[PDB]
Design an enzyme around this catalytic site. Structure first.
Site, mmCIF file in Angstrom:
data_model
loop_
_atom_site.group_PDB
_atom_site.id
_atom_site.type_symbol
_atom_site.label_atom_id
_atom_site.label_comp_id
_atom_site.label_asym_id
_atom_site.label_seq_id
_atom_site.Cartn_x
_atom_site.Cartn_y
_atom_site.Cartn_z
ATOM 1 N N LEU A 13 35.099 26.381 45.944
ATOM 2 C CA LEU A 13 35.358 27.285 47.061
ATOM 3 C C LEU A 13 36.143 26.595 48.187
ATOM 4 O O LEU A 13 37.026 27.219 48.776
ATOM 5 C CB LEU A 13 34.042 27.880 47.611
ATOM 6 N N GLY A 14 35.810 25.335 48.469
ATOM 7 C CA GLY A 14 36.441 24.534 49.513
ATOM 8 C C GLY A 14 36.139 23.051 49.409
ATOM 9 O O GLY A 14 35.203 22.654 48.709
ATOM 10 N N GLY A 16 36.817 18.862 51.681
ATOM 11 C CA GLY A 16 37.000 18.166 52.953
ATOM 12 C C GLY A 16 36.046 17.019 53.222
ATOM 13 O O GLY A 16 35.069 16.817 52.499
ATOM 14 N N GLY A 17 32.005 17.715 52.913
ATOM 15 C CA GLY A 17 31.666 17.806 51.499
ATOM 16 C C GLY A 17 32.291 18.976 50.759
ATOM 17 O O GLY A 17 32.727 19.955 51.377
ATOM 18 N N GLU A 18 32.325 18.871 49.413
ATOM 19 C CA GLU A 18 32.866 19.869 48.481
ATOM 20 C C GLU A 18 31.876 21.020 48.283
ATOM 21 O O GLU A 18 30.674 20.782 48.174
ATOM 22 C CB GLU A 18 33.178 19.199 47.130
ATOM 23 N N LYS A 34 26.983 23.268 48.702
ATOM 24 C CA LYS A 34 27.736 22.198 49.347
ATOM 25 C C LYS A 34 27.206 20.883 48.782
ATOM 26 O O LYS A 34 26.016 20.590 48.916
ATOM 27 C CB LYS A 34 27.603 22.286 50.880
ATOM 28 N N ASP A 120 34.237 23.811 66.167
ATOM 29 C CA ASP A 120 35.420 23.865 65.297
ATOM 30 C C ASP A 120 35.725 25.300 64.844
ATOM 31 O O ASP A 120 36.113 25.529 63.695
ATOM 32 C CB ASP A 120 35.299 22.915 64.083
HETATM 33 O O1 LIG Z 1 35.249 33.607 45.229
HETATM 34 C C1 LIG Z 1 36.322 33.555 45.792
HETATM 35 O O2 LIG Z 1 37.394 33.013 45.269
HETATM 36 C C2 LIG Z 1 36.534 34.086 47.181
HETATM 37 C C3 LIG Z 1 36.233 33.056 48.244
HETATM 38 C C4 LIG Z 1 37.212 32.179 48.687
HETATM 39 C C5 LIG Z 1 36.944 31.241 49.667
HETATM 40 C C6 LIG Z 1 35.672 31.172 50.242
HETATM 41 C C7 LIG Z 1 34.667 32.037 49.793
HETATM 42 C C8 LIG Z 1 34.960 32.966 48.797
HETATM 43 N N1 LIG Z 1 33.356 32.032 50.321
HETATM 44 C C9 LIG Z 1 32.558 31.070 50.831
HETATM 45 O O3 LIG Z 1 31.384 31.322 51.109
HETATM 46 C C10 LIG Z 1 33.081 29.683 51.035
HETATM 47 C C11 LIG Z 1 32.122 28.666 51.084
HETATM 48 C C12 LIG Z 1 32.468 27.376 51.430
HETATM 49 C C13 LIG Z 1 33.786 27.069 51.684
HETATM 50 CL CL1 LIG Z 1 34.214 25.456 52.167
HETATM 51 C C14 LIG Z 1 34.775 28.031 51.596
HETATM 52 C C15 LIG Z 1 34.430 29.347 51.288
HETATM 53 N N2 LIG Z 1 35.461 30.310 51.337
#
Ligand SMILES: O=C(O)Cc1ccc2c(c1)NC(=O)c1ccc(Cl)cc1N2
Length: 270
Positions: A13-14, A16, A17-18, A34, A120
């Site tokens: 999802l993201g 930077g 923790g993963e 996380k 932030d």
């Molecule tokens: O499932 C998908 O691809 C859609 C989606 C895309 C980005 C995020 C989320 C959901 N939802 C999220 O909850 C999310 C969680 C943590 C991080 Cl670092 C980013 C997030 N953004």
């Protein structure tokens, strides 16, 4: 019930923790996990998260430690990031931005009320659920600015330069709440213009100087209507002591302007 404690990691999802999307083996419930290789910073994140309970704040379900790796179980927001709802050099329809700004204020009012500053606030950290409800995300840079009804002034440099308040770059000490108010104003600017006004709020930045000189005939201000622009004139005030507070943002004309219709409900005719 065997296997309810098992979750499959199905996508990233993201970083930077993963953070990975986790799906429950039995129930198929979706959560955000996380994963932090501690290899103190995450200890403060878990503890600030344990204090939080609000509909506009990413929900904390708990944490588990497996040696040097910390697992934080957080609310999965299927709508993704607010950042991806912003169309470059355009923004989004003004009624959508107003609704997101209302939900951002409820979230920030909540955090400030329990003495927490996020530090932030930006569209990357504003997540949307399945009904496009905004949730304040990531308490990694967050801190306590009020304890036992006593305010502690901050001095640490935190945030992202296009969203930081100018007092963070000019003064040794500053109040926490006007800093979060300023970043919300930059978020509002991005939502209505699809661009960031300056790289940083300093006099060396031509765009920041133009704003203090009230050159609103220039971008991004030219793309923004007079009613939300009058609010941005009250939020993006250089002196944090003169900057509008959230109780007064809630009394602003544009903040209270009827603009958006409720979520489209199924209907039939005759
Ligand atoms: O499932 C998908 O691809 C859609 C989606 C895309 C980005 C995020 C989320 C959901 N939802 C999220 O909850 C999310 C969680 C943590 C991080 Cl670092 C980013 C997030 N953004």
């Amino acid at each position: 019930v065997p296997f309810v404690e098992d979750w499959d990691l199905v996508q990233t999802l993201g970083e930077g923790g993963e953070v990975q999307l986790a799906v429950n083996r039995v129930t198929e419930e979706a959560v955000a996990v996380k994963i932090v290789d501690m290899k103190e910073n995450i200890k403060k994140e878990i503890c600030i998260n344990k204090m939080l309970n609000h509909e506009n704040v990413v929900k904390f379900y708990g944490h588990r430690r497996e040696g040097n790796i910390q697992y934080l179980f957080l609310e999965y927001c299927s709508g993704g990031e607010l950042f991806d709802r912003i169309e470059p050099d355009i923004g989004m329809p003004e009624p959508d931005a107003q609704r997101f700004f209302h939900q951002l204020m409820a979230g920030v009012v909540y955090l400030h009320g329990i003495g927490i500053t996020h530090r932030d606030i930006k569209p990357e950290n504003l997540l949307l659920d399945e009904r496009d409800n905004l949730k304040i995300s990531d308490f990694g840079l967050a801190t306590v600015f009020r304890y036992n009804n006593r305010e502690r002034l901050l001095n640490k440099m935190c945030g992202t330069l296009p969203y930081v308040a100018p007092e963070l770059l000019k003064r040794r000490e500053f109040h926490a709440e006007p800093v979060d108010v300023w970043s919300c104003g930059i978020v509002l600017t991005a939502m209505l213009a699809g661009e960031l006004p300056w790289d940083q709020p300093s006099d060396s930045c031509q765009e920041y100087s133009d704003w203090k000189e009230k050159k609103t005939y220039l971008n991004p201000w030219k793309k923004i209507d007079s009613a939300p622009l009058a609010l941005l004139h009250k939020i993006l005030v250089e002196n944090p002591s003169a900057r509008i507070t959230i109780p007064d943002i809630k009394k602003d004309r544009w903040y209270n302007k009827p603009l958006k219709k409720g979520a489209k409900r199924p209907r039939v005719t005759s």
